[PDB]
Each structure stands twice: as structure tokens, then as C-alpha cells.
Amino acid sequence: SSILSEVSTRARSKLPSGKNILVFGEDGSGKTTLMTKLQGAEHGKKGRGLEYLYLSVHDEDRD
Amino acid sequence: TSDAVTFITYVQSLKRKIKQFEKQVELYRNGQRLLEKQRFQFPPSWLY
Amino acid sequence: FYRNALTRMPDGPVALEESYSAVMGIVSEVEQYVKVWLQYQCLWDMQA
């Protein structure tokens, strides 16, 4: 058995993933504005509690 | 002085090959980054 | 307009928190079911 499994097991390399960024900013300190401008959106949603956004990070060298 | 001048004429010959070598270099950065973005399995004997 | 009801919570943030928990639950399971399935892509990375 295996063989197919073990030859599949030899994945050549990997690209970084699974990072994380926290923040604190006081209520209405433009933290949402700064974060939303990072990925390009003019504004997200000023809500209550923990919120959640992206960093769509693109590298041309690794494409 | 024969040994020194032999060294010097050898490095003068290398002078010409320097630029052909350099263009070999960037053409293989071309090829290698291409091959990575073509996602081809680099063999174990591949020298990075 | 009134934005304080979270502190006006009768049961404290627990009802909020558990809600978030469901999210962290579901998404995790999702990627799990993804992960093993996504493993099949390895088949191309190896050549005949």
C-alpha cells in the first residue's frame, strides 16, 4: 500500500500563511479607518465588539 | 614574472566572460522564477 | 443612537461570546473538511 501516499508526501515547499494582527484603538480613533484603508476599502463597518478584516498580501516574486 | 603575467592574461580572458556570465545569471533568474511560478517540482539534484 | 446594550447585557458578554464561539466552531470544521480534500492537489505536484 501507500507508495502513492509517500510519493505524494514529498511536497516541494510552502508559502507563508496563517498570520494574525491584533490592535487596540480607543472608541472612534479611526482604527477602523486605518485598517480599511490598508486593504483599500474606504470604510468598513463601525460596530461594537471584536471586528474582522483582511490583508490581501500579494508578492510578485513568488507570484 | 611569467607566472604573474599568466595570472593576469587569464583574468583578462575572464574579463570578457564576466558579462556573458552575468547575462546568463539574470536569464536564469528569469528561468528559475518562471519555473517556480510554473510550479515545477525541483529535483533533489537541482542546485539552488 | 443607543450603543451600550452590550454592557446592558442581562447575562454578561457570555451570550455574545458563545455566539462568536459558534463562528470559530463552524469555520474550523469547514477548513478541516477542506484540508484533507485539498490534500489531493499534491497529486499534480508530483510528476509521472
UniProtKB/Swiss-Prot annotation, chain A:
ATP binds at residues 25-32. It is found in: Cytoplasm, Cytoskeleton. Belongs to the dynein light intermediate chain family. Acts as one of several non-catalytic accessory components of the cytoplasmic dynein 1 complex that are thought to be involved in linking dynein to cargos and to adapter proteins that regulate dynein function. Cytoplasmic dynein 1 acts as a motor for the intracellular retrograde motility of vesicles and organelles along microtubules. May play a role in binding dynein to membranous organelles or chromosomes. Homodimer. The cytoplasmic dynein 1 complex consists of two catalytic heavy chains (HCs) and a number of non-catalytic subunits presented by intermediate chains (ICs), light intermediate chains (LICs) and light chains (LCs); the composition seems to vary in respect to the IC, LIC and LC composition. The heavy chain homodimer serves as a scaffold for the probable homodimeric assembly of the respective non-catalytic subunits. The ICs and LICs bind directly to the HC dimer and the LCs assemble on the IC dimer. Interacts with DYNC1H1; DYNC1LI1 and DYNC1LI2 bind mutually exclusive to DYNC1H. This is Cytoplasmic dynein 1 light intermediate chain 2. It comes from Homo sapiens (Human). The chain holds residues 37 to 99 of 492 of the full protein.
UniProtKB/Swiss-Prot annotation, chain C:
Dynein heavy chains probably consist of an N-terminal stem (which binds cargo and interacts with other dynein components), and the head or motor domain. The motor contains six tandemly-linked AAA domains in the head, which form a ring. A stalk-like structure (formed by two of the coiled coil domains) protrudes between AAA 4 and AAA 5 and terminates in a microtubule-binding site. A seventh domain may also contribute to this ring; it is not clear whether the N-terminus or the C-terminus forms this extra domain. It is linked to Charcot-Marie-Tooth disease, axonal, type 2O: An axonal form of Charcot-Marie-Tooth disease, a disorder of the peripheral nervous system, characterized by progressive weakness and atrophy, initially of the peroneal muscles and later of the distal muscles of the arms. Charcot-Marie-Tooth disease is classified in two main groups on the basis of electrophysiologic properties and histopathology: primary peripheral demyelinating neuropathies (designated CMT1 when they are dominantly inherited) and primary peripheral axonal neuropathies (CMT2). It comes from the Eukaryota. Belongs to the dynein heavy chain family. It is found in: Cytoplasm, Cytoskeleton. Cytoplasmic dynein 1 acts as a motor for the intracellular retrograde motility of vesicles and organelles along microtubules. Dynein has ATPase activity; the force-producing power stroke is thought to occur on release of ADP. Plays a role in mitotic spindle assembly and metaphase plate congression. It comes from Homo sapiens (Human). Homodimer. The cytoplasmic dynein 1 complex consists of two catalytic heavy chains (HCs) and a number of non-catalytic subunits presented by intermediate chains (ICs), light intermediate chains (LICs) and light chains (LCs); the composition seems to vary in respect to the IC, LIC and LC composition. The heavy chain homodimer serves as a scaffold for the probable homodimeric assembly of the respective non-catalytic subunits. The ICs and LICs bind directly to the HC dimer and dynein LCs assemble on the IC dimer. Interacts with DYNC1LI1; DYNC1LI1 and DYNC1LI2 bind mutually exclusive to DYNC1H1. This is Cytoplasmic dynein 1 heavy chain 1.
